[PDB]
Structure 1
Amino acid sequence: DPKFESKAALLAARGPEELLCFTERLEDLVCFWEEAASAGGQYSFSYQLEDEPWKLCRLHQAPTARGAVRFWCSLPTADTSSFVPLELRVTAASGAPRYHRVIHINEVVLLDAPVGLVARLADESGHVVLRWLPPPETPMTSHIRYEVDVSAGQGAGSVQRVEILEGRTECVLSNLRGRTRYTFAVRARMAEPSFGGFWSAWSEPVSLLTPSD
């Protein structure tokens, strides 16, 4: 729940006004949407699995942001099964259409932020060696793809963003100016094709000052 709040905020900022579903692991699945606060059980969540009957999920109301309410539902772990089309339908109290989506659990994976980020100055030319670890307690270690962000200290810093190939947890960065503080952070997501989803939150930043050439 404390980490679920931080994860929902990342997805809401990316794509508001739409039903968002995410899974930390294949077993679970949470769907939410941010709607403006109404003073007036207003909606009914319906989901259907493959070769299974239509069922209804418990809707939870929680206020968030500024004058907004976030309705979220957590599907049962037993009903969740990956690699299967899951038809979702949110219906209003009167019977009005609110949301209608068909998603696959394996395609909406939202991993946790990586940990153990360590930056080191390489003696060759003055480059930086980054080493990080996968998110804690996460299966399918060999299928995680990463992405590092090299931010410049002074002013607007977003000079470099390197995509790391799946399976390796370290990289050697190049082309950095001396006497400049570079701040590094690494992303994480499940690599295609069997798995899909969204980028995870950035790891704890690690800053390092580069010597003069």
Structure 2
Amino acid sequence: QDVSLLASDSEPLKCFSRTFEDLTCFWDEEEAAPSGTYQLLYAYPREKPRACPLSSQSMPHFGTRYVCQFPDQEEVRLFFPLHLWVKNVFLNQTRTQRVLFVDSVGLPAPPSIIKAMGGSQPGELQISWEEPAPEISDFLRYELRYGPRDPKNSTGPTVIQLIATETCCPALQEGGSCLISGLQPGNSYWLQLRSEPDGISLGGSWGSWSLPVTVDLPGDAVALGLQCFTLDLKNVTCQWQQQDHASSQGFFYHSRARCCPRDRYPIWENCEEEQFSRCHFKSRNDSIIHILVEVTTAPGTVHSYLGSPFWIHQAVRLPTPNLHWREIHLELEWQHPSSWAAQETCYQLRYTGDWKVLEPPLGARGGTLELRYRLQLRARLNGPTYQGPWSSWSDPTR
């Protein structure tokens, strides 16, 4: 019955239930506190009145606060009126009265333990928690607060109502789960939760926030320049710029429309490996793959970085083509080893006798250039069905 538990208001005898299996009522009087003066009585509609054992607290003023706690031997029944009246033993007066529906009053406790970890996208945060009272997991609506850390602390904390499992945030699945997107990829966040019974079935108010928990988001992988491809729709090979004085390793993950993270779906798997650090492994296509890289900057400290999810058919790297040169004015002629599609490949040529480039139409096999010079052609697949990044640069052609 601490001061932080004073969210109640507008009653002479305030009562509140935390798990809908316990009850405690209190009242405060500004006058003095003679010993044994006041007794609290209660009675369900059938049994005789019974006296709750009292306790006294010392207010900052000269008054005192009297608090009752229902014995565990007695049980509280929902949807049942309860008559509570404080009776002075000396003057026989009834200081206060109230008829209470236990289901209408509620101060649910915040979740005891919270988990906050990075999700699939670089700007997604996954939150999972257990419930102090798992029996009423379906009759509670949660509210979520997250805020930036000491840097940029001027911005006010943001709240969000965890609606339901329809938004991939099931309150029950024992403990619940949720996923929140749009956070800044890389700065730490402090997080707090909240709860409130839904007025449809159980009435009440909000409980206090949980102890704030800090989560370090992975962040975008562009900080280390993670750009990689796949070859001929069969194998995934990823190489990243190796961080100086820090060993780095990378993992991966596969999924197919898993959507809602009921039980922390992302489970990493090691990538086989045989300046810049590379990795390589097999693939099961027509799936979404999330790529992660972890680097140990110092012994015992590691950092996780995440890049945009790949589509294998959308990131295939073509073999580097070769170009033939002709002149009288200078003509062009080139081919493509990957004969899957020519009009789906957008080429580019860098020329120099300060470098300048031009983009011939996709599918072209020849052209004219103005001029000794070296010709280097690069291919990028950009078809509506198959696409991918740029290929390697071929040897210069005179």
TM-score, normalised with respect to structure 2 = 0.45
The amino acid that maps onto 1:181 is: S
Q: Tell me if 1:127 matches 2:124.
A: yes
Matched position secondary structure for 2:46: coil
Partner of 2:158: 159
1:62 aligns with 2:67: no
Alignment correspondent of 2:81: 85
Deviations 1:107-132 (A, max 9, x none): 22333321331112234151211111
Distance 2:24 2:38 in 1: 16
Q: 1:138 and 1:67 mapped to 2: Cα distance?
A: 41
What residue ranges of structure 2 are gaps of 5+ in the alignment?
165-170, 223-398
Q: Which runs of 5+ in 1 are unaligned?
A: none
Distance in 2, Cα, partners of 1:12 & 1:91: 23
| TM-score between the two structures when normalised by the length of structure 1 | 0.77
Cα displacement (A) at 1:103: 1.0
Q: 1:123 to 1:139 in 2, by over 3 A?
A: closer
Give the total of aligned pairs. Answer: 206
Q: Is the CA contact 1:17–1:34 (under 8 Å) kept in the aligned structure 2?
A: no
Q: 1:142: Cα distance to partner?
A: 3.7
User: Higher relative CO (CA 8 A, sep ≥ 6), structure 1 or 2?
Assistant: 1
- Tell me the amino acid that sits aligned with residue 19 of structure 1: L
**Could you tell me how far apart the structure 2 residues matched to 1:142 and 1:45 are?**
33
Sequence identity percentage: 27
Query: Partner of 2:14 in structure 1?
Result: 20
The structural deviation recorded for 1:208 is: 2.5
Partner of 1:98: 95
Is 1:176 paired with 2:183? yes
Whichever of the two has the greater Rg, that structure is 2
CA-CA distance at 1:207 after TM superposition:
1.6
Distance in 2 (CA, whole Å) between partners of 1:200 and 1:110 is 5
Alpha-carbon distance in structure 1 between the residues aligned to 2:42 and 2:131? 32
Q: Give RMSD over aligned pairs.
A: 3.0
2:13, 2:5 → 1: CA distance? 10
Equivalent residue letter for 2:215: L
Give structure 1 regions of 4+ aligned residues with deviation exceeding 4 angstroms. Answer: 64-68
The CA deviation string for residues 61-82 of structure 1, in whole angstroms up to 9 with x for no partner, is: 2225555422011234436332
Q: Where do residues 105-120 of structure 1 align in structure 2 (5 Å cutoff)?
A: 105-120=102-117
